[PDB]
Structures are given as structure tokens and as C-alpha cells.
Design goal:
The structure is cut from a larger assembly and holds one copy of chain A (415 residues), one copy of chain B (140 residues), two copies of chain C, two copies of chain D and one copy of chain G (124 residues). Chain C is mainly α and 143 residues long. Chain C is 70% helix and 0% strand. The longest helix of chain C is centred in the middle third of the chain and has 14 residues. In chain D, α1 packs across α2 and α2 crosses α3. The chains are: A mainly alpha (415), B alpha/beta (140), C mainly alpha (143), D mainly alpha (216), G alpha+beta (124). Chain G: One of its GO terms (cellular component) is U4/U6 snRNP.
């Protein structure tokens, strides 16, 4: 009934202990189909309550935490059997599914349906992901029958619980989506209802979402950034995540997506804040409209380019030699553009003699010229033709800055 | 181009054009509207004209229409351009052996611009002739 | 049960005395509870900055990591803490626990256990209060 | 043959002008010329030409024109390339032009290929990968190959390696007497690396560790 | 020889208004050519 | 996986190695090793290289018997190009031919048509 | 005239003082302009006090910050002018929220403390 859910919340907090949770796990298990079923039923049933949130705003983070814990436990169980699985498959439900598949046995050593199961049974698995998994298996998956049957059983139990939790979460999200046109209308208007639900659910409540700073919003719903998986897009959009898959961004060209995405994040945040501020049964949603309009305008501007330049004219060729200057100051700069004395010497070639070349492996052509003194040349080489300091390839302002930044980063890393 | 470069109507107009630009150089393409080579030249010159607006003006002329200036080439009439500064006709020695007019298409825009610049310089000096920086010989 | 209040108190303490490592530790512990489960790394960094990589803060961080069950990281943290100040107790216990959890062995630890213990370290101190040995005490703590 | 495109451009423009013999028409014509040019440019880039205010029929005509150009242009380029290969006869700027055009088409093909790949996944079916990864792994096992570790912080043969790296980079500039900007920058960087070797090493290792997004 | 486009031209003639003609979007360089020119030239400002 | 630019036309290199990255040669070689292995088979590769502790000088062997064991006498790879020198005792060759025929029918005898040959000579 | 929900609005002199502090804070890299930055500061706990803008329109983009402050026990004011605030921060553009942050070793600690006290007095 309606009264169950604070109890549920309390139960969820008892799991917040650490791995190994064993007696705790048993408790956890008890806590599971007790609570993770009734809730689902309630959700399914319409007109039980409209003020379930913010008690479901209280619970979703707890749920998330629980799921994370479960995932960790699973990894612990499996690591030393298959360490890289965690690395490769980050999503916890997905990981669980993979584990389940892996365990299955029967025709699994050759090919069940092995590489068939991943795509279908663990629905999430994309080709790239699958390939890497396969590679990992080939290298690091030990495929000797599980350390004990007990261990296997435990893992199965974990999977069952984790899966259930995931299902519950999904249900909650769905419920939120169904509601959110009432909950966070502005946000919905900005983005789209499902997206809003996803964001909001991730946050906690609307308040939680509002509290979240705009730059973070972007990378909500991102798939855990793997080192091995490729990233750079034509878009230039580092984040992806729920917002990036919105209509508001994805309709425009990929040129604009990064900037557009950024714009959306901030506006989304603003919308969320507005929603939080509002009392129930106000549904203003004028601000959101305005924001949307502005976003559209911005997009349009970004897509439109500069009007053609009036082709800049070649200057009336007059051949002025007005300048005539010098100065310790000025002569340095000009030194960089002067041919230096050694270069001048090089440019001089002795008449009768075969001139001193240097055999650069790239090209032998190079004439060392009469920079090396005859006698010197006959004997050997010279740093007398390494005279000047005023033309020693300095960096740009930009380049210098970049190098400094790099250095700073390195320093930070070292600390 | 047809739209971009201004085209002249009758010999008087041409004469006026040649006279009036005291500051700039004047490039008159004399060519029959529908010819290939002439068209190519026009296209080239369109590009150049905008670039060199500050030192040289381009104009086009239908040579079959305006027959006043068959003094300029002795009734040979290929698809030509001609160069003027202070109403003085400007001679540009290419390889071609006709120093008076370039009667051949040059494909490089930049090259064309350079030659224009050279002739402008010559004009400024007062030199009626000028030696082009590009040899040609082949086009003719 | 009250956690918001605790957080508030911690904040107040920080405002009054920022450098105090115990406050930082408390804050870290609170964070580990998992209301945020975020702004966690940043918070840790802040703590480190304020406390100047204080022995205790590092230990706390390690503990948190252990709880979360990223074990290598936790171990690293513990090592760092030890380096900062070996005499302190609870750190050793934590390290031992970590070792037990993993496949690594304790021989090295034992070898390096020549240095002191109950000079500082809360849990360790408590245990001591509750005796004369050292290895036995450690064992008890582990249990 | 290269004139053909020009002719097409002219002719089309003329037709357009004829179609609209309105007031203030010269300006309009000029504008349309630019549009025509811009569409072509877009095509060359392999950017789409989706002008918002443009009226349909005109847009269609422009598209047709660009298609025609492509038909003429690509083919022409190919022909030129063939001629060059033969060693038959070619203008000294024409060849250069072809090389640009040819380059562009290469880019277009390669980028299209990439796009296709993106659309329809990697060509390696996982079975194949398994087979070939397996082969590599077995080979490694046979060889008992100790993997190449990450360059240590205090790596033994580190400085020498760095020096070697720098020298190769330099090698290109040793000959040349002037330097453009990019070259100069590179040289400067090399100098910096040489002069602050430790710092450079630190930077490099950091990059190896962490840098996974790069100037294009 | 200019046979493929004639129909299109005719269609265009049929369709367009004067107002429409007046309000052609004076076109922007989609391939940002002038920027590129500015950049390269700057780099290779001799 | 970088953005490859060019005179106002970019793409993103999601597939196929960039040859100009200074290390890329090494990577290419490594890749080709895989292919080489595939070509040879593991055992043949082993025979060619020899044991790990004491490897072979190019085209040498530890014995005349291991040279004569497999059809692939000598193998090498100059980058993309590979060079395999097979040696068949008649019967084996015949068998191979038969197999080929079975897989890929040839009634008309238009296989000498198509077959590449060193027209330089 | 200023929004009612913008509360507490700082008195003229007080407002001026706050602005001065901000300017000092800006100079010292002790300050964090903008809603989102301010929010982040609050989350962190680094915020000493939050300075908002009454003439922020639409006001309701602001009005989470006050709530956050209340929940964190952080003094907060509104000043009247966003433009003025921006100027103080060192930004020609309208800033609406800001946070003067914590840093014990600052020269302006005392000043900051004073402002905080003033803000607290305002609240009730």
C-alpha cells in the first residue's frame, strides 16, 4: 500500500555498507523481493498517489547507490576470473547480463549463439563493444569452471537482484516521464518529455537537477568513457549523453551541435530552476518558450555563414623605401629576418674548388659553402658557423602559452 | 563574366575610358562576345579585376560591334586585350613577338595579376614598354 | 539518522577552523554515506588542499575507496598516508584489511611494522585502552 | 575541355537573367552568380548547399548545374591525371589544378568511405577478430614476449631516445635557408625540448598517459 | 548543348514572383573561404 | 582517430590508420605481423623465426628438415608487399590444383587469360 | 522598482560595500561570477556569501540560489543592479549571481567577514 515506502527507503540505507556484504547480502536479498515488486505494482496502478515524489525523489539516488554497490560486488566476485570485463563493459546491468551469458555453458566454448546472445539477450551490446569483449575473452578470460558452485550461485543471485533493481529504476523513470509534463513542464518544453524524465530521474528530483550546474548536465546519461573506445566526432561534441540526443540539438547541422549543446545545457538548467521555483498548478511555461525561440535563433545564426567579403584589393604598387631605421631594439627583430654572416659565407662558393656539401640523408644537395674556412674544411668542422643568438627560432605567443599550459598540467600530474 | 566586368558600347565610350583613368591603368579586352578564348579571358579578368581594382580597371568590348579600333591591330582581329595609362598605349614584351597586345589566354589568375602590376609599374615610371616576368613563347 | 544537520555542523566547523583535518575526515565520511555520491573527488581534493595532504585525510580517502571497493586505489591511498606519517595506527589496520581482501601478502608489511603504532590513531588508541601487545592488537582489529 | 565548365556557368547565368528581366535586375544577376559559385564551392568541400530563403525552381536549377559540373569536372580531372601518367602533354598550371581537384576527389571518396563504415559498423565480423586476435596471442605466447612497458619516469635510455626523436624532426630543416611560420614554430619547439629536456619528457609522458583529444 | 536545363529555366520563369526575386538570400560563403584566406596568408605573410 | 582537415573540408578518421603519425610505421608493421602469421600459420611462423631464445637470421633455419617440412620455403614482407616462395613435390601441387578446380570450376581453360605476367621481360 | 521575491535586498551603503568586496574578491581570484558558478561554490562549501541581482529578469532563474544558501547556512543578499554587480566582478556583461569564496589566507578576509555579518543581520 501507500505506507510501505519509508520502510523501503530505510531498508535501502541498510545496504549502504561495504563489500563483502554477505549476511548483509542475505538481508539485502530479503529486502529485495519484499520491496522490489510491491513498488512496481504500485507504479503500474493508476491514481494511488500524486505526491509519491518527493519520497521517490528521496529514493532514486539511494536506488542508484544500491545498484552501484551490487555492480561492485559482482566485479569483486568475477575479478581474478575475468578482470577486464569491468573495464570493457561499464554499464552495470549490461555487465550483469554479460556475466549471465558467460556462465550459461552447454555450447558456449565454440559458439552458442555466443556472439548472437550478446546482441540479443544483453540488448545493449553494440558491434564494437562485442569485438572488444571477444578480444578480452581470447586474452584474459580464464574459462576454467567457476572457483566453486557456491560462487556461481552467489553471482547468479547478484545478477537477479541487480536486474530487478534496474527494472525498478526503469519503471520509476517511466512514471516520472508520464508525470513530468506536470512536474517540470518548462524543461520538457525545452527538450522533450522522455529526455526530461531521464535527466530528472538521474538528478533525483527537479530540485536536485536545478542544483546541478549547467556544465555537468551535458554528460548525464553518457556511457562510461572508455579509454579504448573511439570518441572524436565530426560534431566536436565531447559529451553526448541524454541532452545531446534531443530534437533541439540533433535537428541542426553537426557544425553547431557543440555550441548548440552547450546552449541547451544552460537553458535546460534554467528551465529546471524555474520549475523548482514554481508551485504545483502554476504551469507558466512562457520563459521556456522564449528560451526555445532564442535557441532556435542561435542555431540559425550558427548555420548561416558570413556574407561574401568584398575581395580585398592589392595595394597601389608604389615601391616606397621610406623606413631607414636601426636601434638595439629594432636591429634584433630585423636580425631574425637578416641573412646572418654565416649564411652569407655559405652563399659564397669558392671558384676552382669543389665546394663543401653536407650529406643530409633527406637530400645530399646541401651546399655548406664557404662558411667553413679552407684549412678548417680540410681538417674538420666548425661551431664558428654557429655564431648568432638573435635568430634562434622563438615560439609564437599562442605556442608559448600552450607549452606553459602543458608544463602546468605535467606539474599537476606529478603532484 | 558578363555581369561583373563593365562592357563598353561604342568607340567613343572606349576612348573616354582610355583617357579618363589618370590614376589607374586601363585594360580593354577587345573580343567577339561568343568566342571561347575571349570568354576565357573575360572569366580570368573578372577574377583579376576585383583584386586589382585599386591599380587597374578592366573593361570588355565586342569587337564586331565597335569597328572604330581596327587601327589598333591592322585587321588581324583575334581575341585580345590592350593596356593604357594616361591615354598612352602600353607595350608589354612577352615571348609572343606582338609587344602591343596579349592575343593569347593565360590560365593563371595570379600570373595575369602580376603582369598587370608590372605594366602599371612601367606606366608609373613612364616606360612605354615593359618586359613581362613570364616568358610565354608557347601560347601566341 | 540525521545527516543534513551533521553536514551543516561540519560546514560550520570548517568556516571556523579550515585546516583541521578531523573536520575534513568527518566530511569525507559523510560524503561516503552516498547522498551525493558526487562532488566527492572534488571535495577530497579541497580537503587535501586545506589540510596540506594531511596524514588523516589521506587515510579517510583510502577508507572511502575501500568501502566503494576500488581496491587498488584504496591501497595506493593507504600507502601515501603511511609515507606521510608511519607512526599513526589505523592506517596500518586499513592496509592489512586491503591486503586480506586482495591476493597480496603481508610479509612486507610485517617487515615495515618495526615502527610505532599507539602514539596516534583513534581506533588503535581505543583498542589499546580496552592491553600490552602489538601484532595481537592488529589481528584483533582485523577481526 | 576545362573551358566547358566555364561555358556552362556562363550559359546558365544568361538563362537565369533571361528568365528574370525585372527592375534592378543587374544586382540580382550578380547575386545569383555568387550563389552559383557558392554552391559549386560547397560541392567541392563536400558540404551540403541548403540555402533557406532560396526559391525552389532556382535552387533546383543550381543543383542541376552543380551536378553537370561534377560530371564534367571529375571526369576531366581523371582524364588529366591519365594524360600526366602517360607523359603526353599538359599545361604547367593545368597539372597543378588537376592535383588540387584530384586531391579533393580523393578526400571526398575517403571521407565517404569513412561515413559508410560509420553507418554500417566495422567490416570485421567478430568471429574473424577472434580468429586473428587468437593467432596474435598464440604467437606472442610462443615468443614469450615481455610487453613493452610505459616509458618509466626515470627511464634509463630516455634522454638518448629523446635526442634521436628531435634529430629526425630537425632533419627536414637542416637543409633549408629560410623558414615559413609553421617550420619556425616546429624548430622552436624542438629547441625547447632540447633545452628543457626533463620538462619535455614530463610533457610527453603526461600526453601518453592522458591526452586522447588532439589538434586536428 | 544547353538542352538539359532549358525545361528547368522555363519552370523557374513560370513560378517566381518579383517579390521572391527581390528577396533572394544574398549568399554567405558556406565553406568559410575568406577566413581561410586570412589565416594561410597570415601564416605565409612572406 | 583525429579530425583530418583540408582546405575547408574536414572528416573524422574513425577507420583506417593515418600513415603520417610518427609512430604509425611501427603500428603498420605490427598489423602486418598479424597478417603474416595468418598467411604462414602459427607453426610455419615458428619454424621461420625459430625459437624465441635463439632466433634465425633472415631465410636461415635450424635444419634442412624443417626447411623441407611445410610448402612455404621462404617468407618475407616488405611493408604492404609480401613474398612467399612455395616448394611443392609434384603430388602435393597436383592435389592443390585439384582442390582449386573443385572450389573454382574451370571448363573453358580461360585462366591463362587474366593471369598477370612480368611484361617487362 | 525591484522585485519582492529578491530578498534580502541590501541597503545602498551595504550594497556598495558588497560591490567593493566583490571587486577585491575578483582581483584576488576569490570570487565566482554567475548562477552556475555560484551554485557550484555552494555545493562545494567554498562560498562565504552569495550576492544576487534584484533586476535579474526573469527573477526565477535566480531564486534557487537563496534556497541553497538557506539549506547550507550561507549569508546571501541581493544587490539591486545586475550591471553594477557585473562591473564589480570585472565583466561588462550583466552578471546576476556571484559567490565570494573562502580562503583564510586572503588579505580581504576581514572585509569578507564584515560583509557576511551584515548579510546575516539583514536576513532574520
Amino acid at each position: 500500500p501507500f505506507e510501505i515506502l519509508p520502510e523501503s527507503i530505510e531498508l535501502f540505507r541498510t545496504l549502504a555498507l561495504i563489500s563483502p556484504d554477505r549476511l548483509s547480502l542475505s538481508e539485502t536479498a530479503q529486502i529485495l523481493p519484499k520491496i522490489v515488486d510491491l513498488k512496481r505494482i504500485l507504479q503500474q496502478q493508476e491514481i494511488d498517489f500524486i505526491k509519491l515524489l518527493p519520497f521517490f525523489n528521496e529514493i532514486i539516488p539511494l536506488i542508484k547507490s544500491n545498484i552501484k554497490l551490487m555492480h561492485n560486488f559482482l566485479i569483486s566476485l568475477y575479478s581474478r576470473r575475468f578482470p577486464e570485463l569491468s573495464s570493457l563493459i561499464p554499464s552495470p546491468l549490461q555487465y550483469s547480463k554479460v556475466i549471465s551469458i558467460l556462465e550459461n555453458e552447454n555450447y558456449s566454448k565454440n559458439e552458442s549463439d555466443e556472439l548472437f546472445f550478446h546482441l540479443e539477450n544483453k540488448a545493449k551490446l553494440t558491434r564494437e563493444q562485442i569485438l572488444v569483449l571477444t578480444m578480452s575473452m581470447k586474452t584474459s578470460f580464464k574459462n576454467k569452471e567457476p572457483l566453486d558452485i557456491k560462487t556461481r550461485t552467489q553471482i547468479l543471485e547478484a545478477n537477479s537482484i541487480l536486474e530487478n533493481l534496474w527494472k525498478l529504476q526503469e519503471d520509476i523513470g517511466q512514471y516520472i516521464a508520464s508525470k513530468i509534463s506536470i512536474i517540470a513542464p518548462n524543461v520538457c518544453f525545452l527538450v522533450g518529455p522522455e529526455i526530461a524524465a531521464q535527466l530528472i530521474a538521474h538528478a533525483g528530483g527537479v530540485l536536485e537537477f536545478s542544483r546541478i550546474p549547467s556544465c555537468n548536465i551535458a554528460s548525464i546519461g553518457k556511457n562510461k568513457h572508455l579509454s579504448h573506445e573511439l570518441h572524436t566526432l565530426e560534431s566536436g561534441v565531447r559529451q553526448e549523453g541524454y541532452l545531446f540526443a534531443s530534437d533541439m540539438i540533433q535537428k541542426f547541422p553537426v557544425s553547431v551541435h557543440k555550441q548548440m549543446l552547450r546552449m541547451l545545457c544552460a537553458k535546460v538548467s534554467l528551465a529546471a530552476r524555474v520549475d523548482a521555483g514554481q508551485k504545483n498548478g502554476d504551469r507558466n511555461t512562457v520563459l521556456a518558450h522564449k528560451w526555445k525561440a532564442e535557441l532556435s535563433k542561435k542555431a540559425r545564426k550558427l548555420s548561416e555563414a558570413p556574407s561574401i567579403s568584398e575581395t580585398k584589393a592589392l595595394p597601389i604598387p608604389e615601391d616606397q623605401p621610406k623606413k631607414k631605421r636601426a636601434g638595439r631594439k629594432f636591429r634584433k627583430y630585423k636580425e631574425k629576418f637578416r641573412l646572418s654572416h654565416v649564411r652569407q659565407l655559405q652563399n659564397r662558393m669558392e671558384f676552382g674548388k669543389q665546394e663543401q656539401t653536407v650529406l643530409d640523408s633527406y637530400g645530399e644537395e646541401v651546399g655548406l659553402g664557404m662558411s667553413n674556412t679552407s684549412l678548417q674544411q680540410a681538417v674538420g668542422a666548425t661551431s664558428g658557423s654557429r655564431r648568432s643568438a638573435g635568430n634562434q627560432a622563438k615560439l609564437t605567443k599562442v605556442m608559448k602559452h600552450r607549452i606553459s599550459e602543458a608544463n602546468q598540467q605535467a606539474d599537476e600530474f606529478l603532484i | 563574366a558578363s555581369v561583373l566586368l563593365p562592357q563598353l558600347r561604342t568607340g567613343w565610350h572606349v576612348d573616354q575610358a582610355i583617357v579618363t583613368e589618370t590614376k589607374r591603368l586601363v585594360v580593354i579586352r577587345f573580343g567577339r562576345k561568343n568566342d571561347r578564348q575571349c570568354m576565357i579571358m573575360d572569366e580570368l579578368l573578372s577574377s583579376i579585376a576585383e583584386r586589382v581594382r585599386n591599380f587597374a580597371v578592366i573593361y570588355l568590348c565586342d569587337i564586331d560591334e565597335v569597328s572604330d579600333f581596327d587601327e589598333m591591330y591592322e585587321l588581324t582581329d583575334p581575341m585580345t586585350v590592350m593596356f593604357f595609362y594616361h591615354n598612352k598605349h602600353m607595350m608589354c614584351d612577352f615571348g609572343t613577338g606582338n609587344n602591343n597586345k596579349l592575343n593569347f589566354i593565360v590560365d593563371d589568375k595570379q600570373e595575369m595579376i602580376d603582369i598587370l602590376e608590372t605594366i602599371f609599374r612601367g606606366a608609373r615610371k613612364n616606360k612605354g614598354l615593359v618586359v613581362s616576368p613570364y616568358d610565354y613563347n608557347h601560347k601566341r | 539518522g540525521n545527516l543534513d544537520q551533521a553536514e551543516l555542523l561540519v560546514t560550520q566547523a570548517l568556516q571556523k577552523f579550515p585546516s583541521n583535518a578531523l573536520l575534513w575526515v568527518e566530511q569525507i565520511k559523510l560524503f561516503k554515506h552516498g547522498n551525493k555520491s558526487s562532488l566527492k573527488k572534488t571535495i577530497f581534493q579541497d580537503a587535501l588542499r586545506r589540510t596540506q595532504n594531511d596524514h588523516r585525510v589521506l587515510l579517510e580517502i583510502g577508507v572511502s575507496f575501500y568501502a566503494e571497493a576500488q581496491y587498488e586505489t584504496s591501497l595506493k591511498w593507504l600507502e601515501r598516508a603511511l609515507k606521510k606519517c608511519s607512526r599513526y595506527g589505523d592506517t596500518w589496520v586499513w592496509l592489512f584489511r586491503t591486503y586480506a581482501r586482495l591476493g597480496k601478502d603481508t610479509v612486507d608489511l610485517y617487515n615495515m611494522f618495526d615502527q610505532c603504532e599507539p602514539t596516534y590513531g583513534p581506533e588503535w588508541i581505543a583498542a589499546s585502552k580496552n592491553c600490552t601487545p602489538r601484532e595481537i592488537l592488529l589481528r584483533l582489529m582485523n577481526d | 575541355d576545362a573551358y566547358y565548365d566555364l561555358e556552362l556557368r556562363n550559359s546558365v547565368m544568361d538563362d537565369i537573367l533571361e528568365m528574370m528581366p525585372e527592375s534592378i535586375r543587374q544586382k540580382k544577376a550578380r547575386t545569383i552568380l555568387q550563389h552559383l559559385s557558392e554552391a559549386w564551392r560547397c560541392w567541392k568541400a563536400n558540404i551540403p548547399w541548403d540555402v533557406p530563403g532560396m526559391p525552389a525552381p532556382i535552387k533546383k536549377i543550381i543543383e542541376r548545374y552543380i551536378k553537370s559540373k561534377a560530371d564534367a569536372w571529375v571526369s576531366a580531372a581523371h582524364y588529366n591525371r591519365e594524360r600526366i601518367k602517360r607523359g603526353a602533354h599538359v599545361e604547367k598550371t593545368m597539372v597543378k589544378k588537376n592535383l588540387g581537384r584530384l586531391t579533393r576527389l580523393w578526400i571526398k571518396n575517403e571521407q565517404e568511405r569513412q561515413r559508410q563504415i560509420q553507418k554500417n559498423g566495422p567490416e570485421i565480423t567478430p568471429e574473424e577478430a577472434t580468429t586473428i586476435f587468437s593467432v596474435m596471442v598464440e604467437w606472442l605466447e610462443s615468443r614469450s614476449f615481455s610487453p613493452i612497458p610505459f616509458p618509466p619516469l626515470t627511464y634509463k635510455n630516455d634522454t638518448k631516445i629523446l635526442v634521436l626523436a628531435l634529430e629526425d624532426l630537425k632533419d627536414v630543416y637542416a637543409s633549408k635557408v629560410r623558414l615559413n611560420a609553421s617550420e619556425r614554430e616546429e624548430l622552436a619547439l624542438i629547441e625547447e625540448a632540447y633545452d628543457n629536456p626533463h620538462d619535455t619528457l614530463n610533457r610527453i609522458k603526461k600526453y601518453l598517459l592522458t591526452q586522447r583529444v588532439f589538434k586536428p | 548543348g544547353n538542352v538539359d536545363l532549358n525545361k528547368l529555366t522555363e519552370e523557374r520563369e513560370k513560378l517566381l514572383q518579383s517579390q521572391i526575386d527581390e528577396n533572394l538570400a544574398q549568399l554567405t560563403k558556406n565553406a568559410s573561404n575568406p577566413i581561410q584566406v586570412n589565416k594561410p596568408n597570415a601564416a605565409t605573410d612572406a | 582517430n583525429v579530425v583530418i582537415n583540408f582546405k575547408d573540408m574536414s572528416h573524422v578518421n574513425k577507420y583506417g590508420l593515418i600513415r603520417g603519425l610518427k609512430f604509425a610505421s611501427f603500428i603498420f608493421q605490427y598489423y602486418g605481423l598479424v597478417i603474416d602469421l595468418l598467411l604462414l600459420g602459427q607453426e610455419r611462423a615458428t619454424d621461420l623465426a625459430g625459437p624465441a631464445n635463439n632466433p634465425n637470421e633472415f631465410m636461415q633455419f635450424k635444419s634442412k628438415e624443417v626447411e623441407k617440412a611445410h610448402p612455404i620455403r621462404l617468407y618475407t614482407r616488405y611493408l604492404d608487399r609480401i613474398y612467399m616462395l612455395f616448394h611443392f613435390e609434384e603430388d602435393e601441387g597436383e592435389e592443390l590444383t585439384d582442390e582449386y578446380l573443385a572450389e573454382n570450376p574451370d571448363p573453358n581453360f580461360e585462366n591463362s587469360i587474366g593471369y598477370n605476367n612480368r611484361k617487362c621481360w | 522598482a525591484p522585485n519582492p521575491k529578491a530578498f534580502p535586498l541590501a541597503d545602498a551603503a551595504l550594497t556598495q560595500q558588497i560591490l567593493d568586496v566583490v571587486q577585491q574578491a575578483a582581483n584576488l581570484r576569490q570570487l565566482k561570477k554567475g548562477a552556475n558558478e555560484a551554485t557550484k561554490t555552494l555545493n562545494r562549501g567554498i562560498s562565504e556569501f552569495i550576492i544576487m541581482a534584484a533586476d535579474c529578469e526573469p527573477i526565477e532563474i535566480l531564486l534557487h540560489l537563496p534556497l541553497l544558501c538557506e539549506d547550507k547556512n550561507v549569508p546571501y543578499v541581493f544587490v539591486p543592479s545586475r550591471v553594477a554587480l557585473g562591473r564589480a566582478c570585472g565583466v561588462s556583461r550583466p552578471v546576476i549571481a556571484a559567490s565570494i569564496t573562502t580562503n583564510d589566507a586572503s588579505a580581504i578576509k576581514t572585509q569578507i567577514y564584515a560583509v557576511k555579518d551584515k548579510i546575516e543581520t539583514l536576513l532574520i
